[PDB]
Amino acid sequence: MPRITENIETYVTHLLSDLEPVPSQNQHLAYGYPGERQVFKDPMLDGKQVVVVNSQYDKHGRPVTGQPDVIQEANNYIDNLVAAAKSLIDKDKKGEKDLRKNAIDEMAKTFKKSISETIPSDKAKADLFSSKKSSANKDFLEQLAKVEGSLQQFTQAVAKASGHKLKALDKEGHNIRSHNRDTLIHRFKAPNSKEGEEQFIMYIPCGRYTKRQQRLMGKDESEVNRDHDTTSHKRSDLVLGNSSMARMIAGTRHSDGTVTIHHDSFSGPGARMPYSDFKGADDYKKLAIKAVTLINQEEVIQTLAQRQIDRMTNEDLWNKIPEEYRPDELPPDAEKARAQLIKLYVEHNPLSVTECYTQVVTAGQRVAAENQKEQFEYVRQMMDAFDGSKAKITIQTGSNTEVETAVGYQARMSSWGVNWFRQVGALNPLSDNSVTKNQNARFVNQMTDDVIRNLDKVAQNLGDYDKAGALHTLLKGPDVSDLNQQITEKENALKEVKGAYREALFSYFEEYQKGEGKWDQAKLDQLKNQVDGYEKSIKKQESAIYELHNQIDALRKAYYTEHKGQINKALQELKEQISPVIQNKETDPETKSRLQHFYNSCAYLTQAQELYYENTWHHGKNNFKLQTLMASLSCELDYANTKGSKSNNDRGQRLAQKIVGNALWTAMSEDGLYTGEFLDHRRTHGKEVSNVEQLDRELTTIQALHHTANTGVSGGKFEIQDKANFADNGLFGKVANFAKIKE
Numbered sequence: 072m073p074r075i076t077e078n079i080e081t082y083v084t085h086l087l088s089d090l091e092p093v094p095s096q097n098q099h100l101a102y103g104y105p106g107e108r109q110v111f112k113d114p115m116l117d118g119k120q121v122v123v124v125n126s127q128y129d130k131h132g133r134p135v136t137g138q139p140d141v142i143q144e145a146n147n148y149i150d151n152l153v154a155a156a157k158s159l160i161d162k163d164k165k166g167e168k169d170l171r172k173n174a175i176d177e178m179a180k181t182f183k184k185s186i187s188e189t190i191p192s193d194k195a196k197a198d199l200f201s202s203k204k205s206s207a208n209k210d211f212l213e214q215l216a217k218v219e220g221s222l223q224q225f226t227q228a229v230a231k232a233s234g235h236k237l238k239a240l241d242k243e244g245h246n247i248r249s250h251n252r253d254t255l256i257h258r259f260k261a262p263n264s265k266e267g268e269e270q271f272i273m274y275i276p277c278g279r280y281t282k283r284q285q286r287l288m289g290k291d292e293s294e295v296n297r298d299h300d301t302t303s304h305k306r307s308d309l310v311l312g313n314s315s316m317a318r319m320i321a322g323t324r325h326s327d328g329t330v331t332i333h334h335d336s337f338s339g340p341g342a343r344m345p346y347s348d349f350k351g352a353d354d355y356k357k358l359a360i361k362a363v364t365l366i367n368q369e370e371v372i373q374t375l376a377q378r379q380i381d382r383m384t385n386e387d388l389w390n391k392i393p394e395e396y397r398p399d400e401l402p403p404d405a406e407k408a409r410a411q412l413i414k415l416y417v418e419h420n421p422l423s424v425t426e427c428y429t430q431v432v433t434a435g436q437r438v439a440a441e442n443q444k445e446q447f448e449y450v451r452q453m454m455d456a457f458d459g460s461k462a463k464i465t466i467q468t469g470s471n472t473e474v475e476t477a478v479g480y481q482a483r484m485s486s487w488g489v490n491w492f493r494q495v496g497a498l499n500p501l502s503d504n505s506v507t508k509n510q511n512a513r514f515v516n517q518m519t520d521d522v523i524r525n526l527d528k529v530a531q532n533l534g535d536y537d538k539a540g541a542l543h544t545l546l547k548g549p550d551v552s553d554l555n556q557q558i559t560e561k562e563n564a565l566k567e568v569k570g571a572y573r574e575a576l577f578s579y580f581e582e583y584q585k586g587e588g589k590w591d592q593a594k595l596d597q598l599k600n601q602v603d604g605y606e607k608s609i610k611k612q613e614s615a616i617y618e619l620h621n622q623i624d625a626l627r628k629a630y631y632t633e634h635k636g637q638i639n640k641a642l643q644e645l646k647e648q649i650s651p652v653i654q655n656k657e658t659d660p661e662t663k664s665r666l667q668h669f670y671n672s673c674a675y676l677t678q679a680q681e682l683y684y685e686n687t688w689h690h691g692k693n694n695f696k697l698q699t700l701m702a703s704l705s706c707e708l709d710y711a712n713t714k715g716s717k718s719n720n721d722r723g724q725r726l727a728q729k730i731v732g733n734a735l736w737t738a739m740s741e742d743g744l745y746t747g748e749f750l751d752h753r754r755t756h757g758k759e760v761s762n763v764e765q766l767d768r769e770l771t772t773i774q775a776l777h778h779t780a781n782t783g784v785s786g787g788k789f790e791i792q793d794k795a796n797f798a799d800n801g802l803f804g805k806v807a808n809f810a811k812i813k814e
């Protein structure tokens with residue numbers, strides 16, 4: 072029931088050992104692909120499970136694992152729907168239960184045999200790395216269509232036996248599926264993986280409710296274990312909690328079983344609000360949605376703070392407990408000692424957290440909007456509602472213990488879409504490009520200052536390297552603090568108002584929860600009118616702030632175009648001087664990372680400035696580049712990177728794929744310095760491909776397990792806008808559709 076309370080490095084190290092195998096009858100969920108997708112018990116949490124895939128290859132070095140097989144997905148669909156139907160007919164008012172269930176089985180048993188019998192095992196599989204119009208993939212599509220039709224009949228029939236509509240059946244799958252989410256792991260040798268080492272990627276589930284959330288779901292306050300795995304589509308009736316949210320970790324396992332961790336951030340969450348509830352909603356119900364997204368933002372704050380704690384070793388924690396409050400001796404028990412160490416760590420240490428949310432929805436889209444504009448506006452309103460302030464979080468210290476604290480919160484948010492509508496021709500009615508023009512402008516300002524203020528900080532110090540200092544001089548951009556100042560005065564003026572606004576909004580939601588029968592109308596109108604007052608007020612002030620930001624944007628652009636050519640030369644010179652030092656084995660481990668961090672931090676900014684100021688980020692061949700570079704940056708500055716789309720299954724995942732690939736590709740070079748190669752390479756899908764292509768090929772495996780975990784079936788169905796950006800050819804998106812089908 073508990074979320075991780077141990078040190079992350081330690082938890083990962085255990086997750087990669089020998090674990091206890093789990094029998095099929097005991098899995099929480101059907102993953103298919105026996106012998107590929109193996110299932111074990113979590114080495115620490117009792118009742119928790121883990122899925123692990125190892126890459127395996129054919130004679131040509133092409134991956135055999137992580138390929139769609141129609142039979143297997145069909146199995147998953149059946150199995151995963153059967154569970155849903157059972158659950159549903161278990162909890163309903165009607166009788167006949169066992170007769171209903173026993174029938175569903177009979178039907179499932181026969182549908183499997185029908186499939187295995189009509190679908191040639193050899194034609195059942197796809198190659199992701201060839202072309203979809205090849206004879207083999209064309210045979211695969213043929214079987215898929217056939218199979219789709221049967222799962223249609225299968226479900227039509229399960230609806231009828233169970234006595235439940237499809238809509239309910241889907242709804243319930245999302246309910247039960249989001250309870251015991253398994254850890255998902257993929258191991259494989261990256262290109263150039265040293266002798267007897269392996270790389271790995273894992274998604275660790277991480278939702279825990281906040282106290283407020285707990286009280287409101289009407290459950291018991293004094294519970295330390297507040298688990299949930301809310302799925303991509305569990306957003307129906309003012310539900311609380313974040314959806315589709317995982318800790319994402321990538322590293323290498325050394326020959327002695329220890330672990331270097333190269334990447335550590337969040338996959339998710341999807342939409343922070345229960346988007347379903349917009350459907351013909353009045354202004355009263357919209358405001359409630361707003362409150363909810365606020366209530367989930369405070370859970371995000373809690374989650375980032377748990378993550379900081381667990382990125383800290385027991386020495387780390389001890390080093391931050393001032394000498395005079397350290398206990399005489401630690402407790403004998405590994406666990407109860409860490410518990411005490413976190414408690415004391417927290418008690419005596421102001422904590423704060425920085426979220427960098429790289430959103431990937433297209434906020435301005437005008438058709439099948441799917442309320443994407445709110446998903447932008449509302450989340451940005453609320454990350455900002457909390458920016459520069461404190462939230463009462465709880466930190467879980469042991470399996471039975473927690474503590475309370477304020478955590479400070481700083482927010483950074485971008486929104487650059489990634490789909491066909493991401494940028495649209497002038498006058499094109501299909502989408503409003505400028506819905507996010509202001510925010511992104513702002514974001515780019517904040518993130519540059521952050522780096523600047525970070526450079527000046529370590530710039531002064533390491534000066535036995537002089538191309539560093541000149542680079543520094545240039546990145547400084549233009550003198551702009553005249554305007555920055557005004558910005559930070561006005562941001563400060565905003566803080567008190569935001570706080571009242573939050574309390575008012577929490578308050579409002581508290582009444583609205585009761586319902587029309589129990590609402591007190593007078594109180595409700597009071598509460599609403601309070602909020603909008605504050606809102607109107609903030610909005611006005613926020614408007615003024617952007618103007619000053621756009622004034623800066625005008626200025627920084629001007630600067631870039633002039634200095635682009637200089638800067639990249641001066642970037643290149645810094646490479647030239649730094650690298651040699653880096654490979655050299657006498658240089659200590661500490662100085663080296665300060666070089667790496669300085670250089671990469673700079674490389675990311677410049678390469679983002681290019682795409683942003685020249686407005687090229689949207690060109691097909693650059694599709695995910697600006698977002699990935701910004702997120703990679705936020706990881707350099709040690710921020711927590713949250714990223715995603717609406718349900719974080721399709722767009723949110725390919726972004727993650729790029730962020731991790733680049734992370735690994737960079738961490739395994741002779742040097743550790745980002746070279747853009749992983750982003751820039753044009754994947755050819757040939758039979759002989761480059762090393763980055765060979766690595767890109769590995770990355771869709773974890774996406775598919777993630778997808779199964781949310782939906783019951785493999786996938787991700789992002790419509791690729793330029794084939795050169797990816798090693799795979801989309802084919803899991805066909806199976807991805809199984810979840811979709813409805814009568």
Ligand SMILES: CCCC(=O)OC[C@H](COP(=O)(O)O[C@H]1[C@H](O)[C@@H](O)[C@H](OP(=O)(O)O)[C@@H](OP(=O)(O)O)[C@H]1O)OC(=O)CCC
Pocket residue numbers: 303438439490491716717718719720721722723788789790
């Ligand atoms: C060919 C079908 C035409 C259509 O329906 O129009 C909208 C959609 C825009 O595509 P998108 O924004 O890449 O797709 C959405 C997609 O439209 C939407 O279905 C997805 O939500 P859901 O399926 O998980 O509920 C959402 O999932 P993520 O939130 O990114 O995981 C995306 O896959 O597709 C297009 O390509 C239109 C271009 C002409």
